[PDB]
Amino acid sequence: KHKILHRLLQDS
Amino acid sequence: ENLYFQGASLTEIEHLVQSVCKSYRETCQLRLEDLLRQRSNIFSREEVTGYQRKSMWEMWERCAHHLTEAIQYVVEFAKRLSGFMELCQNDQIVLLKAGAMEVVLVRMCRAYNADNRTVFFEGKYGGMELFRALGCSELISSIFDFSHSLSALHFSEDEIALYTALVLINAHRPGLQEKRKVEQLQYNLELAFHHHLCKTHRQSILAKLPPKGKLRSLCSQHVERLQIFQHLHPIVVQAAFPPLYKELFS
Ligand SMILES: CCS(=O)(=O)c1ccc(CC(=O)Nc2nc(-c3cccc(Cl)c3)c(C(=O)c3ccccc3Cl)s2)cc1
Numbered sequence: 416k417h418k419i420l421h422r423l424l425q426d427s
Numbered sequence: 428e429n430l431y432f433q434g435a436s437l438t439e440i441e442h443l444v445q446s447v448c449k450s451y452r453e454t455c456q457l458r459l460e461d462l463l464r465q466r467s468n469i470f471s472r473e474e475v476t477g478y479q480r481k482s483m484w485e486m487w488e489r490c491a492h493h494l495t496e497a498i499q500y501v502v503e504f505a506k507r508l509s510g511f512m513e514l515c516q517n518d519q520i521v522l523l524k525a526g527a528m529e530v531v532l533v534r535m536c537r538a539y540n541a542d543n544r545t546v547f548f549e550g551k552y553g554g555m556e557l558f559r560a561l562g563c564s565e566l567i568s569s570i571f572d573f574s575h576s577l578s579a580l581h582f583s584e585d586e587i588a589l590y591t592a593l594v595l596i597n598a599h600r601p602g603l604q605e606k607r608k609v610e611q612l613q614y615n616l617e618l619a620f621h622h623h624l625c626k627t628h629r630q631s632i633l634a635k636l637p638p639k640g641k642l643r644s645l646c647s648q649h650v651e652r653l654q655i656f657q658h659l660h661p662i663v664v665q666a667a668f669p670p671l672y673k674e675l676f677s
């Protein structure tokens with residue numbers, strides 16, 4: 416899933 | 428895609444030094460001077476007893492939360508690192524999953540006071556007896572000993588910045604798709620770190636740095652202790668552990 420990690424990496 | 432994915436000149440290595448040191452200053456969580464100023468602020472015997480009296484599950488939850496906050500700053504550091512955002516999503520995840528905890532473990536030596544063997548936790552300094560409710564004494568003593576050995580090196584902020592950039596950009600992590608891109612970025616960060624040490628007459632620390640196996644052992648020990656706790660209190664982990672902590676460690 417890595418939902419949070421993906422979100423943190425895509426948040427500019 | 429990025430200059431640091433190819434062979435870099437001395438001038439470009441000198442810029443990498445500045446860039447890494449800037450990325451670190453902006454993502455450090457606590458300033459070194461604040462941590463140093465608070466060294467006289469130690470938990471009393473009554474306060475220590477109070478931490479020891481907390482339930483195991485409550486102590487784990489507080490520690491998982493504090494770890495998650497530190498890790499969030501490591502994610503920001505990674506994002507500000509030259510070339511990291513240019514790697515693919517698979518590789519950024521791979522690197523952060525294997526290295527985020529290792530970076531936190533290294534950053535922790537700034538918050539560790541080798542004079543009285545105390546660490547800054549929840550507003551004050553406390554010894555390892557403060558974490559006795561966790562029921563993972565060997566892990567705690569191994570972490571204090573690691574922080575103790577790192578403290579003996581008298582790292583500057585710039586050294587921690589450059590050494591943590593390297594702890595994270597490790598081309599040997601299993602699962603990397605673009606291994607050669609990561610190998611070149613690691614080589615350039617190695618040159619930047621060794622260049623800074625050469626320039627500051629600090630090459631003598633190279634022989635004193637911990638082996639990579641030491642940081643891997645500490646991370647594996649943390650995951651093993653989490654698995655024991657998880658079997659005892661599965662609902663606590665499911666309901667009250669931060670989601671980022673669970674993605675990285677569960
Ligand atoms: C890390 C960046 S900074 O130096 O700015 C900065 C930020 C916040 C703090 C406060 C804090 O959050 N203090 C903690 N100290 C400890 C701890 C526990 C055992 C040994 C050692 Cl040395 C430290 C914690 C853990 O929860 C913990 C950590 C690492 C490994 C396992 C645990 Cl259980 S949280 C300290 C330092």
Ligand code: NA
Nearest residue numbers: 536537539578
């Ligand atoms: Na220290």
